[PDB]
């Protein structure tokens, strides 16, 4: 029942500002401290700042003093992290954790909201190829090629088909990602039935439902 939920992935242009949010539930918002940490790509965690929602006691580190500004909305249970003068090296996953004291802190953590300081994907349907059914099961795939930025959200039959869906990790080449997804449908069902692969790219506001045909 204790949960800290953070905003979704953000895409910020350089020299810009981001206001992430971390809403809390399952506990007294104004009795626990709110700490923020970030993890640039291959760097290890860095402590950013902290705020006591009850008192509005915000304590930073010398480094982020002027660029990070935490605010708390006592009514909505949300703590906000403003970040200005965005640089490439700011690209990282920002996380929030609650705490009580140096003896008890960083027990419950958010999920992390990724910030990246816009090209939609090109989806290609992958039909079996080897038409000689491997067994009672046949597998279709969807190639989500050349997109930016992360992420995309692949779905099969708009969620109807959730059994045996394997969405693999993206690869990167020249600032463009590409990723694969698959779903194993029992022979009988396809192509007798229509199988669609839905791909959404939040950052560009595009959605593509590709009917995968043989």
């Amino acid at each position: 029942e204790v949960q800290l939920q953070q905003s979704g992935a953000e895409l910020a242009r350089p020299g810009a500002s981001v206001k992430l949010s971390c809403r809390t539930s399952g506990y007294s918002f104004t009795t626990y401290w709110m700490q923020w940490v970030r993890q640039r790509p291959g760097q290890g965690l860095e402590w950013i700042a902290a705020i006591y929602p009850g008192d509005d006691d915000a304590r930073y580190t010398q480094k982020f003093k002027g660029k990070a500004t935490l605010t708390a909305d006592r009514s909505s249970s949300i703590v906000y992290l403003q970040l200005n003068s965005l640089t490439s090296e700011d690209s990282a996953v920002y996380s929030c954790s609650r705490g009580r004291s140096l003896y008890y802190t960083m027990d419950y953590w958010g999920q992390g909201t990724s910030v990246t300081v816009t090209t939609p994907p090109s989806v290609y349907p992958l039909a079996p190829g080897s038409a000689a059914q491997t067994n009672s099961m046949v597998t279709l795939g969807c190639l989500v090629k050349g997109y930016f930025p992360e992420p995309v959200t692949v779905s099969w039959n708009t969620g109807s088909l959730s059994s045996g869906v394997h969405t693999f990790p993206a690869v990167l080449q020249s600032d463009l990602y590409t990723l694969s997804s698959s779903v194993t449908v029992p022979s009988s069902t396809w192509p007798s039935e229509t199988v669609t692969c839905n791909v959404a790219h939040p950052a560009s506001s595009t959605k593509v439902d590709k009917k995968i045909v043989p």
């Binding site: 960083m106 027990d107 419950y108 190639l143």
Partner: protein, 206 residues
């Protein structure tokens, strides 16, 4: 400020008792360092284990005990359940802020299934062609996927991803060989080879 250091990787068998140390560049680690042990799981899944040097977090199996060993801190896992495979970070309080260790990837079988897909038609039409080889069901997640055209190894063009642990305590990954409409048609076969634990597995298409 200082530099916290942890052993990059500690391997162990289920049930064993392993000890993760953590030290600083400042010197000896006392109680006024309030060491915190954070367990990180895939996708930035953080879970607090110990805090204040040895205070178990709310709801964490007692096999996780924090303690000071000499001038270093120490997270002790006695009876490592397979599920304890993750990264362990020690954070040290250096007046006014925390300083995090890099992490300790604690590592507490099965042969792979290869799945090849020939390029899509709409992609060939764009003078391009990506062969997708999806590797499923391997454990431990550690493979070396190579490609071969006509039996001759290919080097440039292959893009292989990091092994993701499917919930099933097994892994999966995906390699790609980006070719041109021309090259695809130009050859006889295309082989996706994967090497796992001394033994190779390969699947091809024409």
């Amino acid at each position: 400020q200082a530099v916290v250091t942890q052993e990059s990787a500690l391997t162990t068998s289920p049930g064993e008792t392993v000890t993760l140390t953590c030290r600083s560049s400042s010197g000896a680690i006392t109680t006024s360092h309030y060491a915190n042990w954070i367990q990180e799981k895939p996708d930035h899944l953080f879970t607090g284990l110990i805090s204040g040097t040895n205070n178990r977090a709310p709801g964490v199996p007692a096999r996780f005990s924090g303690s000071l060993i000499g001038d270093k801190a120490a997270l002790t896992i006695t009876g490592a359940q397979t599920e304890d495979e993750a990264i362990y970070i020690c954070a040290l309080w250096f007046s006014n802020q925390f300083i995090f260790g890099s992490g300790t990837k604690v590592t507490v079988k099965s042969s792979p299934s290869v799945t090849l897909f020939p390029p899509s038609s709409e992609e060939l039409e764009t003078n391009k062609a990506t062969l997708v080889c999806t590797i499923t069901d391997f454990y431990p997640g550690v493979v070396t996927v190579d490609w071969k055209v006509d039996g001759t190894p290919v080097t440039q063009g292959m893009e292989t991803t990091q092994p993701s642990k499917q919930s099933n305590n097994k892994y999966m990954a995906s390699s790609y060989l980006t070719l041109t409409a021309r090259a695809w048609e130009r050859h006889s076969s295309y082989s996706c080879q994967v090497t796992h634990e001394g033994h190779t597995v390969e699947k091809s298409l024409s």
